[PDB]
Design a protein around this ligand. Structure first.
Ligand SMILES: [Mg+2]
Ligand SMILES: [Mg+2]
Ligand SMILES: [Mg+2]
Ligand SMILES: [Mg+2]
Ligand SMILES: [Mg+2]
Ligand SMILES: [Mg+2]
Ligand SMILES: [Mg+2]
Ligand SMILES: [Mg+2]
Ligand SMILES: [Mg+2]
Ligand SMILES: [Mg+2]
Ligand SMILES: [Mg+2]
Ligand SMILES: [Mg+2]
Ligand SMILES: [Mg+2]
Ligand SMILES: [Mg+2]
Ligand SMILES: [Mg+2]
Ligand SMILES: [Mg+2]
Ligand SMILES: [Mg+2]
Ligand SMILES: [Mg+2]
Ligand SMILES: [Mg+2]
Ligand SMILES: [Mg+2]
Ligand SMILES: [Mg+2]
Ligand SMILES: [Mg+2]
Ligand SMILES: [Mg+2]
Ligand SMILES: [Mg+2]
Ligand SMILES: [Mg+2]
Ligand SMILES: [Mg+2]
Ligand SMILES: [Mg+2]
Ligand SMILES: [Mg+2]
Ligand SMILES: [Mg+2]
Ligand SMILES: [Mg+2]
Ligand SMILES: [Mg+2]
Ligand SMILES: [Mg+2]
Ligand SMILES: [Mg+2]
Ligand SMILES: [Mg+2]
Ligand SMILES: [Mg+2]
Ligand SMILES: [Mg+2]
Ligand SMILES: [Mg+2]
Ligand SMILES: [Mg+2]
Ligand SMILES: [Mg+2]
Ligand SMILES: [Mg+2]
Ligand SMILES: [Mg+2]
Ligand SMILES: [Mg+2]
Ligand SMILES: [Mg+2]
Ligand SMILES: [Mg+2]
Ligand SMILES: [Mg+2]
Ligand SMILES: [Mg+2]
Ligand SMILES: [Mg+2]
Ligand SMILES: [Mg+2]
Ligand SMILES: [Mg+2]
Ligand SMILES: [Mg+2]
Ligand SMILES: [Mg+2]
Ligand SMILES: [Mg+2]
Ligand SMILES: [Mg+2]
Ligand SMILES: [Mg+2]
Ligand SMILES: [Mg+2]
Ligand code: NA
Lengths: 46, 14, 271, 93
RNA sequence: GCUCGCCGGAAGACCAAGGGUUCCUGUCCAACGUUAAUCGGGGCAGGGUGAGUCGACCCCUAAGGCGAGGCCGAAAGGCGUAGUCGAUGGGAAACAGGUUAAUAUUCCUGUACUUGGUGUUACUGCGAAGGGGGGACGGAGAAGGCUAUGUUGGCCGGGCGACGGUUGUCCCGGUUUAAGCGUGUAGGCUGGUUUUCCAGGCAAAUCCGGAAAAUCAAGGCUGAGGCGUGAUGACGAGGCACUACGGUGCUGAAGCAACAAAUGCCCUGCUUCCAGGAAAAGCCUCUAAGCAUCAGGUAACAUCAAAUCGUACCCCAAACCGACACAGGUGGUCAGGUAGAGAAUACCAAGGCGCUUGAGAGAACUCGGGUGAAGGAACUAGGCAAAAUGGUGCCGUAACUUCGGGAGAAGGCACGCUGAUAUGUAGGUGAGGUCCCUCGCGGAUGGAGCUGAAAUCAGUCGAAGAUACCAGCUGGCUGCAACUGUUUAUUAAAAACACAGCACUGUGCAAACACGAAAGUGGACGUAUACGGUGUGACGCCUGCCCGGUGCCGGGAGGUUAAU
RNA sequence: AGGACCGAACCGACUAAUGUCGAAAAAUUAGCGGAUGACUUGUGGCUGGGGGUGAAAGGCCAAUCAAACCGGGAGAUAGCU
């Protein structure tokens, strides 16, 4: 049985990374929401 | 339990 | 030319091939190739605009001279090559100034033959010259639609147009479709039919012989569900509708041309 | 030219262990805990001056900090750089 | 520690992705481990990841992303030029030994190689966002030469056997060594050279392309492997000295030949086919502006730098995805012996493991198996499931057929071992010797060896000789679908979908059509022998009548008829 | 030569049993089909919700699909419990 999460740092970043966020407007609004909620880790950029 | 297993289908009493 | 592949396996049984011996059995000319990446119907936004396009073989694009703007300078057909981008066989040609190009092969043109373009060429097949200097009624090919455009009509295997008449600065062409068009007489036109006339005799035998030409299958409307296509759903082979494309526009007889900016150049409509 | 006010910053502490012992024993190599960036040439010059001993090659690595569950809190330690300095021949501490 | 069992194209070994200390040592058993725990991938502490050469980084580009200006768009924003990012590809270079508790192509020893900086040394036209060459390519097949590698032989060392025999064509073990440098092979491709001219290479160019004429018949490039060297060195069966009982310090023999041989290397080669098989740079030349003691180029020597990050550990798994130490999934590399066609399979090697609860008992009943009297489908919805068949060689093989098939039809016969033909055959391989000359990694002859079928004849054993594992059940009639394929991930694999073929129909290119308020893009860098849509579905024989209706196409003379 | 044949890896999922608070939220065992291709696979990329993709089953689109998931309108509305 092949599950869903096949991890890969490259794809993980390119899709949800910090610069993938700050690229477009919607992503920057996502960042704004994360900061307004005050999260420790804004994006997934371990 | 966030996963809630579906119930098995009931006998087809048609 | 046309060979029937022996029925030594189902799917080989029906094949009819065009085994052209004269075709050059080597690599194509290097400085005239360039990469031709496949698309699969998709476009900028990335959606399948033309269905059924996909898969197949890699192929590089042979830069064929369609313009034939090298006047006077003779040239000799070095060789004839198979082009995957066309149905006609290309010809690597060399001009007396060491410059080598590609052209489409007219019917009667072996390697070693000789041709040259411009107003003062002869009327031997392969020669290009404006359609004012080409006689009336002769069969030409690789026809232009604008002076300097490049040549757009009759580019496919075995095809050809015919100059029916020249009325002033305009030549009337019995286009391969049977449509009588009317373009400027100052548009060059290569002489003689296009070769590879035996192209339409191959039969491809099996489904793979198309899948590697790059045509994913076409699913009938009737098979699909009601949401997928106008012809949709049913309790077993139900139609009751009128034939339309997947977007509900009538197929099987509906004129879908509206230009209004070129309808003046059509002498008479299709047959 | 590499300034003294940086050479006095590069070197932090001399690593001591079984490996540092045996290295000083058999290969004339002193093991040091050097600063984070601490390029091989920086360490070279800093030892050539501060220790005034003769350096041949500097071989450096960065060890990663352990994760340490102090009490019930997941901690971590700093990733620091350890540099092996092969002195030419003479002596050192 | 000794036996026992299992795996061994894996349950072994090394990586990538992924994880992130799980690696090693010391200490502890509260929790975690489906039990116990002194043990642990658990808790605490300490240690451990060393690079000019490996990867990243970096140069170059693919798909594709972003995208100055730009075109478009209520706004956000879309597309896109120049451009710039992007490997899953292209681009310089290290090997063998030794070592740690844990790293080692990184440390140590030895042996190298690459790219640039700079300086002196001479000789020199150098010079690019530009030209050309190159890099630069498919599938399949086949053969030749090789190698890894193994087997045997020969040596070297040791042994003379817990009960019969065993100093002998007896037993066990080792017989290994690299990169680099030199060589230029088997073999692969290619004519070469000098001049001269030219509307091509957006200008130039001697470079490329293209013509001429002479030219000698050779050269050029590619090239596995081998040989020499690397190496009077390392490694080495082992022996001894001391035992932190762990292993340390020394000494250390032989270290050859033949044969077999890869799916690996020559080979990106060769032959062949149609489906016609990335790009850019590094690389080599050509010149443009500019400079021509200079600069810069080449060569020689010296010298310097090769930074930064990764490197522990798991990696068909208790460490990655599956909530679990979960019978699941996970890409790449190596692949030994015997039997075998085989990477199957059986038993084994190196190596690893005994699957983290066990002990008894030997009820029913359930699961996985084994055997079975007589009968042999009578069971049942249905021969479901089991049983059975199963190999190689030869003989033989029907209807039907689209002439290919059907067909492994069906069916039968031989198969072990020993001996001889034949102190092993046919064959393969090939030394020595000898001759020739292009004189060699050469050719011709020659056969020592070293292997080694297959067949026949004779004998023999057993109930059985394809003896285990492995390994077709066969035939007859028939519906449907031509066939290979695809399908409801997870109750439906089919007659459904697709298909090649056929037809109608649209489409004359700024094509139709499609995504998109548009710009645009796909169609297509295609052009009616093309593209789209619809139906039908190989093939054979064919496809009949109806236009009243709905739709489509064509007309415009008349009625009605919108905005105005 | 061949969408050729037998048959491992690999891909799949036809039968049967087991399993059905499983070892496993679809598996194991024994068989079974393809196995040079309309094949399979690694890495990266593209198409996004009335949208995608679809050899077409209403299939798949993160264990969810006759219209995903998250947040908002939202304390929708519920003559029904
Ligand atoms: Mg189509
Ligand atoms: Mg069709
Ligand atoms: Mg169809
Ligand atoms: Mg509809
Ligand atoms: Mg139905
Ligand atoms: Mg019906
Ligand atoms: Mg070093
Ligand atoms: Mg291991
Ligand atoms: Mg820990
Ligand atoms: Mg441990
Ligand atoms: Mg206790
Ligand atoms: Mg316990
Ligand atoms: Mg621990
Ligand atoms: Mg390092
Ligand atoms: Mg853009
Ligand atoms: Mg770049
Ligand atoms: Mg790469
Ligand atoms: Mg290790
Ligand atoms: Mg060998
Ligand atoms: Mg022996
Ligand atoms: Mg193979
Ligand atoms: Mg190119
Ligand atoms: Mg100089
Ligand atoms: Mg390691
Ligand atoms: Mg367990
Ligand atoms: Mg498991
Ligand atoms: Mg084996
Ligand atoms: Mg096995
Ligand atoms: Mg257990
Ligand atoms: Mg029992
Ligand atoms: Mg018995
Ligand atoms: Mg019985
Ligand atoms: Mg009986
Ligand atoms: Mg009965
Ligand atoms: Mg009965
Ligand atoms: Mg059965
Ligand atoms: Mg049985
Ligand atoms: Mg059976
Ligand atoms: Mg079978
Ligand atoms: Mg019937
Ligand atoms: Mg069928
Ligand atoms: Mg099938
Ligand atoms: Mg299903
Ligand atoms: Mg049909
Ligand atoms: Mg009819
Ligand atoms: Mg009518
Ligand atoms: Mg009308
Ligand atoms: Mg096949
Ligand atoms: Mg098979
Ligand atoms: Mg199975
Ligand atoms: Mg089959
Ligand atoms: Mg789902
Ligand atoms: Mg809805
Ligand atoms: Mg409510
Ligand atoms: Mg409201
Ligand atoms: Na009608």
């Amino acid at each position: 049985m092949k599950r869903t999460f096949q991890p890969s740092v490259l794809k993980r970043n390119r899709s949800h990374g910090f610069r993938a966020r700050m690229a477009t407007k919607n992503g920057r609004q996502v960042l704004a929401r994360r900061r307004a909620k005050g999260r420790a880790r804004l994006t997934v950029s371990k | 339990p966030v996963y809630i297993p579906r119930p098995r289908p009931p006998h087809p009493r048609l | 030319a046309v060979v029937k592949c022996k029925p030594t396996s189902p799917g080989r049984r029906h094949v009819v091939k065009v085994v052209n011996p004269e075709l050059h059995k080597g690599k194509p000319f290097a400085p005239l190739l360039e990469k031709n990446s496949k698309s699969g119907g998709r476009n900028n936004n990335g959606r399948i605009t033309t269905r059924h396009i996909g898969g197949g073989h890699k192929q590089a694009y042979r830069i064929v001279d369609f313009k034939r703007n090298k006047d006077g300078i003779p040239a000799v057909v070095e060789r004839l090559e198979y082009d995957p981008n066309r149905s006609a066989n290309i010809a690597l040609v060399l001009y007396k100034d060491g410059e080598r190009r590609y052209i489409l092969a007219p019917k009667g043109l072996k390697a070693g033959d000789q041709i040259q373009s411009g107003v003062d060429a002869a009327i031997k097949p392969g020669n290009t010259l404006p359609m004012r200097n080409i006689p009336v009624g002769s069969t030409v090919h690789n026809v232009e639609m604008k002076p300097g455009k490049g040549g757009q009509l009759a580019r496919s295997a075995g095809t050809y147009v015919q100059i029916v008449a020249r009325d002033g600065a305009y030549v009337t062409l019995r286009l391969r479709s049977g449509e009588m068009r009317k373009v400027e007489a100052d548009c060059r036109a290569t002489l003689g039919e296009v070769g590879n006339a035996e192209h339409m005799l191959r039969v491809l035998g099996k489904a793979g012989a198309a899948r590697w030409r790059g045509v994913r299958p076409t699913v009938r409307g009737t098979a699909m569900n009601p949401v997928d296509h106008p012809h949709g759903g049913g309790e077993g082979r139900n139609f009751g509708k009128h034939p339309v494309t997947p977007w509900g526009v009538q197929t099987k007889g509906k004129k879908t041309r509206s230009n209004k900016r070129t309808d003046k150049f059509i002498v008479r409509r299709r047959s | 030219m590499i300034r003294e006010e940086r050479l006095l910053k590069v070197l932090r502490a001399p690593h001591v262990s079984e490996k540092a012992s045996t290295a000083m024993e058999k290969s004339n190599t002193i093991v040091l805990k050097v600063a984070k960036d601490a390029t091989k040439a920086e360490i070279k010059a800093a030892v050539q001056k501060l220790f005034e001993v003769e350096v041949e090659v500097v071989n450096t690595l960065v060890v990663k900090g352990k994760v340490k569950r102090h009490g019930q809190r997941i901690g971590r330690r700093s990733d620091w750089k350890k540099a092996y300095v092969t002195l030419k021949e003479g002596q050192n501490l």
